[PDB]
DNA sequence: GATTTGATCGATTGAGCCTTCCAGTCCTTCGGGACTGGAATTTTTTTGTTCGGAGAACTATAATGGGAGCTGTCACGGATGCA
């Protein structure tokens, strides 16, 4: 099996258990690889970060789960990768130049 | 609820550490799928012998008419063949 098939399955791996408390080290058990072999191969194809990749969409899916539902932000930290809200809001201001609170108020 | 700061898990990746994925080439080895001579075997028809079989003429005292066990009791009738 060539390597361009695996990252097609690696992105067919991730988007189904984002509401789960998921990490990179369980991907390496499911893909059988080591913990380090995931992060070299993503740069030949995407030229982005795969360590922050599973952390990017826990903003992007909390950009619709907070947006559609009436969920408050202090349960997003304990499940979607963090421990407190003071770090979750900072990753948003580097990505899309916004704060989480005034992200919904903009119709 | 929005942000400011210290260090540390992870690992931005960079090199550095190690055999297999598999086209099938080829190998010496060997009984199968090619039909075969030659040698054995067994009938399958063929040849022949011969004992019984079986067909056949002849048998010269004189012998000159059978019945031979039948039909033991249906009676009514419809045409018949005489008369």
From Swiss-Prot:
Induction: By paraquat. This is Regulatory protein SoxS. It holds the Pfam family HTH_18. Residues 8-106 form the HTH araC/xylS-type domain. The lineage of its organism: Bacteria, Pseudomonadati, Pseudomonadota, Gammaproteobacteria, Enterobacterales. PANTHER family: REGULATORY PROTEIN SOXS, RIGHT ORIGIN-BINDING PROTEIN. InterPro entries: Homeodomain-like_sf, HTH_AraC, HTH_AraC-typ_CS, MarA-like, Tscrpt_reg_AraC-type_HTH. PROSITE patterns: HTH_ARAC_FAMILY_1 (PS00041), HTH_ARAC_FAMILY_2 (PS01124). It comes from the Bacteria. Residues 25-46, 73-96 bind DNA. GO terms for molecular function: bacterial-type RNA polymerase holo enzyme binding; cis-regulatory region sequence-specific DNA binding; DNA-binding transcription factor activity; sequence-specific DNA binding. NCBIfam families: PRK10219.1 (NF007584). The keyword Transport does not apply. One of its GO terms (biological process) is regulation of DNA-templated transcription. It is found in: Cytoplasm. Transcriptional activator of the superoxide response regulon of E.coli that includes at least 10 genes such as sodA, nfo, zwf and micF. Binds the DNA sequence 5'-GCACN(7)CAA-3'. It also facilitates the subsequent binding of RNA polymerase to the micF and the nfo promoters. One of its GO terms (cellular component) is cytosol. Its main location: cytoplasm. Keywords: Activator, Cytoplasm, DNA-binding, Transcription, Transcription regulation.
